[PDB]
Amino acid sequence: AVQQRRSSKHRRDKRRSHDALTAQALSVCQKCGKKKLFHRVCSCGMYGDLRVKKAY
Amino acid sequence: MVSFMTRLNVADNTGAKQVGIIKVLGSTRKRYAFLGDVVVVSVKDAIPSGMVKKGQVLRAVIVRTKKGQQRKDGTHLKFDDNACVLIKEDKSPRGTRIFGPVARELRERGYNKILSLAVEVV
Amino acid sequence: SYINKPGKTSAWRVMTVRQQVSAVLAYGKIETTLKKAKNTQKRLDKLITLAKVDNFNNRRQVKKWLLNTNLFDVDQLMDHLFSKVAPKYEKTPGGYSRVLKLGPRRGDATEMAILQLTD
Amino acid sequence: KINKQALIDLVEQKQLKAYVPEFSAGDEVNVAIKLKEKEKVRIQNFTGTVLRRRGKGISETFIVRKTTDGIPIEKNFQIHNPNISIELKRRGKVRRAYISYMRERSGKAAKIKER
Amino acid sequence: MEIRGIFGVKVGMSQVFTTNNERLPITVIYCEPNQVAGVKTEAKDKYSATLLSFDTVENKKLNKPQQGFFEKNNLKPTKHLQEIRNMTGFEMGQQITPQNLFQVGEYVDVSAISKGRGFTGAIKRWNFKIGPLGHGAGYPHRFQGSVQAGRGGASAQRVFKGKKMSGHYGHEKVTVQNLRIVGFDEANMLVLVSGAIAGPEGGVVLIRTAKKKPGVVKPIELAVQTEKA
RNA sequence: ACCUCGAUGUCGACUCAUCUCAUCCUCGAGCUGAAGCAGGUUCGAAGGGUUCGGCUGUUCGCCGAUUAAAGAGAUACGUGAGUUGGGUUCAAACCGUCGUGAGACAGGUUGGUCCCUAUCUAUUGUGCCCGUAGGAAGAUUGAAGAGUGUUGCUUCUAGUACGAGAGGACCGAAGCGAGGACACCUCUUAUGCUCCAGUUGUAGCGCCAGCUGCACCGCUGGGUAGUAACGUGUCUAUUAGAUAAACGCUGAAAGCAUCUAAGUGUGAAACUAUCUCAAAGAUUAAUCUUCCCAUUUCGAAAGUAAGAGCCGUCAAAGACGAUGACGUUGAUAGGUUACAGGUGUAAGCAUAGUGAUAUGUUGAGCUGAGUAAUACUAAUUGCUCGAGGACU
RNA sequence: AGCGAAAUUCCUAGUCGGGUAAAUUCCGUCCCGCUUGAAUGGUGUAACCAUCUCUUGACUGUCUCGGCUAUAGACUCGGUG
RNA sequence: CAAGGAACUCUGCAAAUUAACCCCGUAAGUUAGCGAGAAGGGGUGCUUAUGUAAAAGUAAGCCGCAGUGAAGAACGAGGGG
Ligand SMILES: [K+]
Ligand SMILES: [Mg+2]
Ligand SMILES: [Mg+2]
Ligand SMILES: [Mg+2]
Ligand SMILES: [Mg+2]
Ligand SMILES: [Mg+2]
Ligand SMILES: [Zn+2]
């Protein structure tokens, strides 16, 4: 099944309205400073005041 | 659930060893006969000294079913082979003697004759 | 379509569980996918709880799961478990392990998670 | 507020029988039935071997398989049912909990009794 | 009319034996006493109804406008509020129990949010039939039939509004009428209904007086045992 | 022979139906060469229902057995971007017949490739944004709508009325069903791949026993939760208004007769409601209740102590989003503990036995999701959006 | 001669018998063979056939009538496109 | 995948049953070779002793729902062109 008429530059742009991205939530790890995405462990390897990994 | 074209044993003395359902009676698309439903059948094997020859269309009352059915009281009566007795036009069997047990659920529909001739009702 | 890979058959899932529990007991940390980690945790906990009594029946029942690793072989890993890992946890009711979420992977944007176990 | 679903079990204690003898799969019991057409309740006895003993409360059920004139009938009763009474005669040896293989085992297939 | 109603949570299903030599399946419904939270009168609000609050909860786990409504109206806080049309014989601030509404063996109807069955296809949804599988009947053989209405501009040239195709099924309200009530239990604030009640084990279940048979009652007793040894 | 040959796919079946009435049944009424039963025909009525099979490529048909009945038609003689290819009609082959011949024949026969990942519209579901002139949470009315509507058999009324006699009811009540629909899983059943037991083979854990992979999950017997039905409950009633055909009461014009002109009625499965569902995006934007908020120093930009979102744990939900519960003041998932249900007497030990193995410890051990407690692990010592009601 | 509604027969779904509850197909049979027919062979024939055609036992999800499970897709996220 | 078991259908297309080895028994018809693996049935596991030179077999005993325990092994009869 093919298009019978080309979908113009107007209909296409409207479809992509819902394609925009979301800014993912960001938290600031305590025990160092940086913006780790929230509910993860930052590159410190420290999650909260507990150690779960190596230096970076 | 005895269905259309279901060969079911005969449990009387009319010499109709094998009989095949031909049209489950009672309303449109009945498509299933439980205990006590009168069906119309056709004999496909007999014995020479028998009052029904091969090919006659007759009517039958089913007594034993393999699927069985849930009774009102909660007991669930289930047999192992399907049986039918051959009736003649009001309630009365064409056979003098009935073989094997017979399910009670014929009692209220009628066929007080068929239950009486039975060895033992269940 | 027709010819297709065997895929995640139930045997694949259970064998992955066995390999990962062997790996986590051997070293003490795993860096895997989150949604395999939440599934490994259950079997991990069940083993460690089944392993606090040390009769030979428990040895048989745990032999059904473990696999040998580069650090420890299976009959070495059993001794390593029952000597130091299992008795360490003998007083904790449940909660033998943790699964914490790492950053998304560059290859697939999967949710890497670390599985470990500490008192 | 909060539920236990031991309430389901609680309401069923309103009708549970007191004795309810215990019998495993392969046992030979007589289950006496009360029947009431109009009056003078007749007791039809129905003896036979048991097959299955499923049940989880007020809904314990059991299968009884009898043979009349070479024709076998299996009948399923509800244990905690008024209008049914159960007596145990012989207790049989068995390795299974639902002996379905008796649907195709004719005469000379009888459980050895238990000591 | 004088419609009577009550709410509960469906706790599960079992069976119980009665006189008349009959086995009766049962649903068990936990009914905490409710509380009228508003009464609508015919003249004042153009209709009549009674607003019932139920599933009592701690004040903390409750939104602020609702807890303010409850404190101002002198009630116990409740998670749920819903109302029944044409309930009249009641006043404000009163506790209502099922024992005070329904006879021992009379006829009710039950509404409940059904069991969400997922995005399901036409043949399970609309009881349609399945194209034959023998004789090699081509790979789309589980479909909604032909949706045709007319070919060519004269005839129909479209699909009819309100067709029958696949979609969402379950998690929608349904009601079973003329289901009798067997018995009660004041100790557990619990009620027994005949038949099978829509909704999952643990949902919310509304009972109203059946419209088909409003006052009709036919008593049904129980089957106390007399076999002990 | 007017569009279509720079292609509008053609018979029949399957699936799905939809619509018309000139009606097959169900319903109401008249006339009868209508005693009763059963009919014959005409009037109104399209709400619903309107079989299964043999033979045939079949429609059509003939025939069997049913049923209340087995309607006539339309929709590109509906429906191949849904299915099939049996038939017609490609090439191969053959009999009959025609032709000297190549070959031909709505004459027959055997065999013979049916493509498409949907852009718009339509439609079924489910959402995002915005609006509804403060902002949010809840509860409502219901304009405009959708869905369902079929019916028999038995008993009594009563062998009463009717009739000579066979035979035999209207009106009405009760019971049991068939088909169709809505849910549910206590019972019966099918399933049920991280459940239980038996069990073959080979290779491994060094050996025995005991286990693991592999073979349709290796095979077989059971099966929790879930999911469905062949299963079990409920429904397919009832009442009211306005009516068509028909019947009228009074009653004239046309001193009588006359259902109509005024007035006043009876009346059907149709119709409008009653019943089930959904519904204020009904921009004609409704109603009620509660909650929160009034500044700034020159329209700004400050932007809630009410709430919503991101994020995490999730299932009563689930295609993704959405719905719904919970986020340390916590029982949302996982784990642990106790239990249910399911399997059905573990492994090891001792006795008998030459041995397979039986017997006692032992209704034992095991157990995915089930029930309920239990903060041990994971739901962070975070982020954003957002109020001053503009005028009559 | 033989054979004959046939791979040949239009009327023809010929008649009759069997099968079948029911049989435009099937087996046998009669013959106004529209136009059968003797090396473009006729008539029989055991074995054989990925051949055709019909009846039948067992057999089964072909079907009354539809259900459940597991995978790979499908659907969602990241990458190429 | 219960009950039914070819009713769907153009046709039993597809799918299903039998399945190796060992022991009985095996019709009509015919070119007298075949038909025929015809049809139709039974046994199969482990232990002990006997078995012969190994083994098949034999008798007794034991377990299971079932013993080429899984996989890989013919479905068949009758008439016609
Ligand atoms: K053309
Ligand atoms: Mg064009
Ligand atoms: Mg997009
Ligand atoms: Mg194809
Ligand atoms: Mg196609
Ligand atoms: Mg992508
Ligand atoms: Zn840091």
> Any idea where the domains of chain C sit in the sequence?
1-119
For E35, counting Cβ atoms within 10 Å of its Cβ (0-12 exposed, 13-18 middle, 19+ buried), the class is: buried
- Enter the tokens of residue A16: 């992509």
> Does any CB of chain D come closer than 8 Å to the CB of residue B75?
yes
Contact E190, E29 (CB under 8 A): yes
Contact E109, E208 (CB under 8 A): yes
Contact C41, C33 (CB under 8 A): no
HSE of E25, CA atoms in CB hemisphere, 13 A: 7
Contact E91, E159 (CB under 8 A): no
Looking at B25-82, which runs of residues are DSSP E strands? 38-45, 57-64, 69-70, 76-79
> How far, in whole angstroms, is CA B59 from its chain's centroid?
9
Q: Inter-chain contact D68–B81, Cβ cutoff 8 Å?
A: no
d(CA D73, CA D47): 11
Strand partners, D90: D28
Domain count, chain A: 1
d(CA D89, CA D27): 8
Q: Inter-chain contact B79–D46, Cβ cutoff 8 Å?
A: no
Of C98, C102, C116, the CB nearest to A40: C102
| Closest nucleotide to B82 by C1' from CA | H3
Q: Can you tell me whether residue E100 is helix, strand or coil?
A: helix
d(CA C96, CA C41): 9
Give me the CA E128–C1' F50 separation in Å, rounded: 20
Contact E197, E110 (CB under 8 A): yes
Contact E75, E53 (CB under 8 A): yes
Name the H helices within E74-178: 122-125
**C32 Cβ contact partners less than 8 Å away, ≥ 6 residues apart:** C20, C40, C112, C113, C115
Host domain of residue B58: 1-122
Strand partners, E35: E53, E95
Residue type at position A17: S
Contact C108, C92 (CB under 8 A): no
* CA-closest candidate to residue C67, choices C11, C3, C9, C17: C17
* CA-closest candidate to residue D48, choices D14, D99, D6: D99
Domain count, chain B: 1
Subunits close to A (at least 3 CB pairs below 8 A)? C
**Bridge-based pairing state of the strands B83-87 and B7-10:** parallel
Strand partners, C31: C114
Question: Best interface-test mutation with B: which of E16, E21, E24, E26 has the largest number of B CBs within 10 A?
Answer: E21
Resolution of the deposited coordinates, in angstroms? Answer: 3.4
> How far, in whole angstroms, is CA D67 from its chain's centroid?
16
**Any idea what the Cα angle at residue E22 is, between residues E20 and E27, rounded to 5°?**
125
Name the H helices within E36-172: 42-45, 64-73, 122-125
- Enter the tokens of residue C76: 């070495």
d(CA C117, CA C40): 12
> Does any CB of chain D come closer than 8 Å to the CB of residue B89?
no
d(CA E219, CA E221): 7
Q: Give the distance (Å) from ligand 1 centre to CA of residue E141.
A: 33
Query: In whole angstroms, how far apart are CA D6 and each of D3, D10, D98, E70?
Result: 8, 6, 28, 33
For E208, counting Cβ atoms within 10 Å of its Cβ (0-12 exposed, 13-18 middle, 19+ buried), the class is: buried
Host domain of residue A6: 1-56
d(CA D49, CA D24): 11
Contact E106, E193 (CB under 8 A): no
Question: D18-22 — which CB contacts under 8 Å span 24+ positions?
Answer: D18/E225, D18/E227, D18/E228, D18/E229, D19/E227, D19/E228, D19/E229, D20/D60, D20/D79, D20/D80, D20/D86, D21/D86, D21/D87, D21/D88
* CA-closest candidate to residue E189, choices E29, E40, E2: E29
**How many CB atoms within 10 Å of residue A18?**
6
Residue type at position D90: R
d(CA B107, CA B77): 15
- Enter the tokens of residue B115: 């239950």
- Enter the tokens of residue A2: 């093919």
Establish whether the CB of E130 is closer than 7 Å to any nucleic acid atom in strand G: yes
d(CA E102, CA E6): 10
d(CA D29, CA E166): 53
Query: In whole angstroms, how far apart are CA C74 and each of B25, C19, C53, C66, C71?
Result: 71, 11, 19, 6, 10
d(CA B60, CA B44): 14
